[PDB]
């Protein structure tokens, strides 16, 4: 269907689904002429990254004869622009052959996506219309748990509501009762703000305003929120939210010089690039926010240093990469070789892996459940009269059955399971926004962590003479409605 | 809708709706009557007949997804490559 798409002929067919843009043009249809098409505009290398991640882990089971001898993957990966419309084209493409034959093509058995919970809910309403797996990476939401309306979803992510008890903790932690709370209108930031408002009322901490930013907020929201932030006296806001949609707050408030600020971070925008800028810091400096556990791929930088525009025919998106990357035509023109390591991008400049592991983990999910398929024994299966499955054929529903029911290990020796509602849990670590004394840019120092497998009470762990307040501060602020009052 | 959990050791199958409702029955007549006494109506849109295409959702969003997937047909096949819908009413 869609053009600049990766593909890849195989057995057995994989779709996927990359935010390779973060957004689309802002172009306003007053009907006058027939819609064509919106265009998007700024393109994210760590979606680009996410994508070679499951290229190589694809590329890696294709090599093994332990894991699916015999039998080759196939992909299908379109881009999305973090948008629900361009996300249902290619769910379309993705399931013409099902659709064809129940209202009356190449056939893909699951689907690894998407990053928004919004877009992977539109996509699980059509996916689980025709019982087609679908594994996740980044979507975070407590509404996809439900599965009474999501049949199909799985996620190698944990969820929401132990990140929010753990901002709770941690303003229990530092003695505070006078905070605000900002978030995201759409299906991240009201759950998570909410499931917060419920802690803090029961831990006796006063909020004192609640406000809700979109990246599509005109002039006035903005002045009435920045107005609502400036008027109160309070000093520690609480944001559920993602870069995208934070950038044009942040941008007035640094445009107003707004400082003293203290900001906890959800895990979507604690390590934004978008926001993370020096030109912010004195702003946004000092912020605590939490992150997901590191994992190690083998190989995988060395995969990512070998793109090259012409050599790779099995992936389309790499003519816009390259011509991003360097700044010429394939306005100076391209020679194709130039490289990598020269320019300063996120596409190698990183230091931990956390949703390119997800993104290697639901893949390798997906394939140990076709080989728990593959070695079906005979009498032996999880399916009628103990009947196998047959694997030279095989279902989009026998995989899902096969996924309900997986224990495998990983790499790094490690059980993987999802739960009842296809879940799976994870620690958090704690980290601080310091800066740079030679580069001068922002680095994230981890402070402490959150063990989600401890008890209540003793859950949280964190070192305060690691952290700086406001970028460069030693003394803890004071965040308090009333001064206390003391005997007599 | 009924209440039958999917195992998964077979094929599965389409659900069944349980209760009546009389009421949205009465909406969709609604409708009906409305189309009708435009049809029978010459000031308003003159020489041209108005037909219509009803389902069922049973408060699901499954089945209202299969009536919609089933109203873009024609568009759905031109854009990724049956008479069309110009307007939906509901849900
Ligand atoms: C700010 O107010 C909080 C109460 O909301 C104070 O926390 C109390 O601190 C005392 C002494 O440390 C404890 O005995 C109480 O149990 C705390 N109350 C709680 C946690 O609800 C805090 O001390 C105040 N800080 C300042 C600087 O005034
Ligand atoms: C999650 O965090 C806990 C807490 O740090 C980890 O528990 C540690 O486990 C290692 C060995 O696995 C021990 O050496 C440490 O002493 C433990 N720390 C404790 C108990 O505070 C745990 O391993 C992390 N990961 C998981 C999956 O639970
Ligand atoms: O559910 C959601 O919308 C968020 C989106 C998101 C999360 N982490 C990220 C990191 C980078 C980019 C986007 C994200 C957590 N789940
Ligand atoms: C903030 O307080 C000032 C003081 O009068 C008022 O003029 C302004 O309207 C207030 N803004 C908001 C958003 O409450
Ligand atoms: C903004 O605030 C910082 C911190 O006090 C100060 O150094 C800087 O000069 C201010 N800039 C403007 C334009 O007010
Ligand atoms: C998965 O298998 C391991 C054995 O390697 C077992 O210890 C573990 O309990 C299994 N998972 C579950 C959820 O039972
Ligand atoms: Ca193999
Ligand atoms: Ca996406
Ligand atoms: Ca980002
Ligand atoms: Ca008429």
Redesign the interface.
Known sequence: ?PDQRAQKKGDIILGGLFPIHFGVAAKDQDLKSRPESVECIRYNFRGFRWLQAMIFAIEEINSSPALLPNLTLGYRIFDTCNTVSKAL?AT??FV?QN?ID??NIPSTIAVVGATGSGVSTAVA??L??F?IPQVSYASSSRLLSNKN?F?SFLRTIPNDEHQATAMADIIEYFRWNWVGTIAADDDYGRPGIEKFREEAEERDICIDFSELISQYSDEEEIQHVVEVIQNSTAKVIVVFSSGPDLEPLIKEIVRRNITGKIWLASEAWASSSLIAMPQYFHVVGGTIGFALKAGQIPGFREFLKKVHPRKSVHNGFAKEFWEETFNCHLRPLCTGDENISSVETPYIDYTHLRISYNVYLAVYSIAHALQDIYTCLPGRG???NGSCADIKKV?A??V??HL?HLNFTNNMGEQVTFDECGDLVGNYSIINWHLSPEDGSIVFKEVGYYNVYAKKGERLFINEEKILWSGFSREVPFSNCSRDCLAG
């Open positions: 269907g084209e379309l493409s013409a659709k129940s209202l309403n059509l689980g219309l019982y309306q049949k999880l399916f009628t279902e529903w026998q899902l059955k309900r």
